[PDB]
């Protein structure tokens, strides 16, 4: 029942009024404390100001912690989410924008929390889409940029021990910093027989080699484009140098609202917090100020944060990963529309997905055919229940 001293950050253009409503409009019966409302406010995007109003905010105010978020592009949102998190030993879970962004390889003692899948798990659901894409053979691409050995790692990994009919040609990783000694755009370009194109790189470099590929033209109609949401970046951003009709997935811009799912996230903070209120029945010694928390560092030993790292709220799983990734991550499939803009593909959550339509992402050869099963001439077939794959040539058909 203890009121949780907290600060919910607001910076830039944001409506926190309704946030105050809902956070004050609910009462948590299962949790020790009912749902509560405390809302921080900020304007400037200077991280110095972040330390100012924030490090001054939660420390100066009465709090055992705070959940800060905003919609800005800040990578320092994560850098000081963990850096300031453990620096304050305070859990930091981004609820929006550059905050909710998944931190890449945080610090050991880093207290910053998170929710989502792994970029690994992301591309894994992407492999499930390849099953929806029903492309048995495949191929990928990457730069020398980060996640390289990671994406290939979990890539070949998912492509490794499975009993699935997954197959892939190869993936060309390189660095476009200097010139291409072989102009290897063409070299690996012809090497690609798979329609699906899956690359890992920065959106700008993605335009460098993507436009370079338009020059190669290897993107020519009949291929397919799998893009990282990170490589994608802004849904509003639609660089034409990138491949048209590209496909991706991420946390839902349409379906998932920042204030709503964020409010539910605060309720999850209540869930694990009350869980520790029962289990731990105590807390480490808080010291608000930096120099104050400087002496109280050693006083922080959290197995309840571990107990918090395993959590669920409102029926949703609040358990984070070692990456902070949601134990039950949910995501929205993404696409690049015919608008010369992105398209909403669908929604994919934790070994489940909502596809755009029964038909494949038809382009704009392929010809529809339908009939009835009369054996031996025509046999219906039951695809693998656990999977849907099959031996030989068996293909599917329509069912209303």
């Amino acid at each position: 029942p203890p009121s949780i001293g907290i600060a919910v950050i607001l910076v830039g253009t944001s409506d926190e009024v309704a946030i105050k409503d809902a956070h004050e409009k609910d009462d948590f019966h299962h949790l020790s404390v009912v749902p509560r409302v405390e809302l921080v406010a900020m304007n400037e995007t200077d991280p110095k100001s972040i330390i100012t109003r924030i490090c001054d905010l939660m420390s100066d105010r009465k709090i055992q912690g705070v959940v800060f978020a905003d919609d800005t592009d800040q990578e320092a949102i994560a850098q000081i989410l963990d850096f300031i998190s453990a620096q304050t030993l305070t859990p930091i879970l981004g609820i929006h924008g550059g905050s909710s962004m998944i931190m890449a390889d945080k610090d050991e003692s880093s207290m910053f929390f998170q929710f989502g899948p792994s970029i690994e798990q992301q591309a894994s659901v992407m492999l499930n889409i390849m099953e929806e894409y029903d492309w048995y053979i495949f191929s990928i691409v990457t730069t020398y940029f980060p996640g390289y050995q990671d994406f290939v790692n979990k890539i070949r990994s998912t492509i490794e021990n499975s009993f699935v009919g997954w197959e892939l040609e190869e993936v060309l990783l390189l660095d476009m910093s200097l010139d291409d000694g072989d102009s290897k755009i063409q070299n690996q370009l012809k090497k690609l027989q798979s329609p699906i194109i899956l690359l890992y790189c920065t959106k700008e470099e993605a335009t460098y080699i993507f436009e370079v590929a338009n020059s190669v033209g290897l993107t020519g109609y009949g291929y397919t484009w799998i893009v990282p949401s990170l490589v994608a970046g802004d849904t509003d951003t639609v660089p034409s140098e990138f491949p048209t009709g590209l496909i991706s997935v991420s946390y839902d811009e349409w379906d998932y609202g920042l204030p709503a799912r964020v409010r539910d996230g605060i309720a999850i903070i209540t869930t694990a917090a009350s869980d520790m209120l029962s289990e731990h029945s105590f807390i480490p010694e808080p010291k608000s100020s930096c120099y104050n928390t400087h002496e109280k560092r050693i006083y922080q030993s959290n197995m309840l944060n571990r107990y918090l790292i395993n959590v669920t709220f409102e029926g949703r799983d609040l358990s984070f990963s070692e990456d902070g990734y949601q134990m039950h991550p949910k995501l929205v499939i993404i696409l690049l529309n015919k608008e010369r803009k992105w398209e909403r593909v669908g929604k994919w959550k934790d070994k489940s997905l909502q596809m755009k339509y029964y038909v494949w992402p038809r382009m704009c050869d392929h010809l529809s055919i339908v009939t009835l099963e009369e054996a031996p001439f025509v046999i219906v077939e039951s695809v693998d229940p656990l999977s849907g794959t099959c031996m030989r040539n068996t293909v599917p058909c329509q069912k209303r």
Binding site: I369, A375, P376, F377
Partner: protein, 87 residues
């Protein structure tokens, strides 16, 4: 339904396609059902999967038939799917 009927003989006979009588011909639990006659031609005809009217694949799909007869794997699957149990 009519197949197990005729198996019991719920009607005097079961009419059906000589193809239906073909896949139905080879595969049978016991030996009871037989063709109309030995299977002598009744309404000689043949089947294929067409396309949109006057489709451009017309001459092309024609060539596909030329591969059908020009295949002999027609004999292959003519066992594989089409080998009968009666023999």
């Amino acid at each position: 339904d009519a197949l197990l009927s005729l198996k019991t003989g719920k009607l005097d006979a079961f009419i059906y396609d000589a193809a239906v009588l073909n896949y139905m011909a080879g595969r049978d639990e016991g030996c009871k059902l037989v063709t109309i006659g030995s299977g002598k031609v009744f309404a000689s005809t043949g089947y294929g999967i067409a396309i949109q009217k006057d489709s451009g694949w017309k001459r092309q799909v024609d060539l596909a038939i030329l591969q059908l007869f020009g295949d002999g794997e027609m004999e292959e699957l003519e066992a594989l799917w089409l080998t009968g149990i009666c023999h």
